[PDB]
Amino acid sequence: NKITPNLAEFAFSLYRQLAHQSNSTNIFFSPVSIATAFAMLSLGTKADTHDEILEGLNFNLTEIPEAQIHEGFQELLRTLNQPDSQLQLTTGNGLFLSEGLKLVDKFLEDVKKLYHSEAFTVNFGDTEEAKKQINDYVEKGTQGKIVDLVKELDRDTVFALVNYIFFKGKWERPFEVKDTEEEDFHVDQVTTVKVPMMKRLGMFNIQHCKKLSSWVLLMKYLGNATAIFFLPDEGKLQHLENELTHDIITKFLENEDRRSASLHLPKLSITGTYDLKSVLGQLGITKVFSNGADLSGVTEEAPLKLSKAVHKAVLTIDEKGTEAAGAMFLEAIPMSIPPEVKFNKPFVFLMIEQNTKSPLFMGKVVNPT
């Protein structure tokens, strides 16, 4: 995809942002879900307010036509929402606008038609009930997985954006539960803690990278995704975080080589929850959240600003998803001593849609608890 390099660059910006804020908590977010929400939003905006958003998503508006961007996001939305896709991604972007406002039809159309997004009317005069309508939405669309997403609305809120994403993948090549057991996870280098730790010996797209100073593992999910894990050498977390590029990731996905390895990989559920007004602000998207906002593509006559924008991402990794799949491969593993590669200290990861090379998720597990 044309916009893929822009999203990769955006993923990286947002990550480095969040990694600098705090090195102690697990990062998890969807670049592609945040980027798409805000691209959609840009359709309601004009002038500087508009230009800030697409620049803040890493587009050079002096180099790439706006249509090419919007074409880019839609071809993406059509790869992750298709019928016979077995990703079991569940994602949503809900727009909550004050009832009382005169909304502008073409926004609501395009949003709904083009960006498969949902827009709703709410009485922001009742602030608790507004949170509760918002949360009920997320809750139903995630069939109970994300509860109480919004905790606080500002006094004068007349517009809220909520963007959610939940992923539980099935591995093309699965782990045996029977082999899952408690094991150490090094949080410090004198400090350890027990987690459940999947294990398999078999043939993996795994290799050590000199320049990144990290082991690099690629595992494919049923449907159209591939997960990449980075295990930094001792002392090289920050170096790895510094040195990651779209070019290096593309390198790795092209390679299909496989070698024998005993793989130890943690079974986890992780979330990250982010105030996007705060986070995207530090990336240069401020006007849309401010009284200066130009949202006249959304409502023509009243002032409008986005008072609230929240992203939640949830990931479950385990041995494997469904109960069956009518299928069984046989790998050929050499009878030689395999490298034992344990994801038993902090590591970085990305999930990539295979068709587009776009960065579905990116994250860092510091502590599986």
Swiss-Prot record:
UniProt-reported outcome of changing P339T: In L-Offenbach
Tissue spec: Ubiquitous. Expressed in leukocytes and plasma.
Chief site of localization: secreted
Domain notes: The reactive center loop (RCL) extends out from the body of the protein and directs binding to the target protease. The protease cleaves the serpin at the reactive site within the RCL, establishing a covalent linkage between the carboxyl group of the serpin reactive site and the serine hydroxyl of the protease. The resulting inactive serpin-protease complex is highly stable.
PANTHER family linked to this entry: ALPHA-1-ANTITRYPSIN (PTHR11461:SF165), SERINE PROTEASE INHIBITOR, SERPIN (PTHR11461)
Subunit structure: Interacts with CELA2A. Interacts with ERGIC3 and LMAN1/ERGIC53. Interacts with PRSS1/trypsin. Interacts with PRSS1/Trypsin. The variants S and Z interact with CANX and PDIA3.
Pathology linked to this chain's protein: Alpha-1-antitrypsin deficiency: A disorder whose most common manifestation is emphysema, which becomes evident by the third to fourth decade. A less common manifestation of the deficiency is liver disease, which occurs in children and adults, and may result in cirrhosis and liver failure. Environmental factors, particularly cigarette smoking, greatly increase the risk of emphysema at an earlier age.
UniProt protein name: Alpha-1-antitrypsin
Organism field: Homo sapiens
Record lineage: Eukaryota, Metazoa, Chordata, Craniata, Vertebrata
Gene that produces this protein: SERPINA1
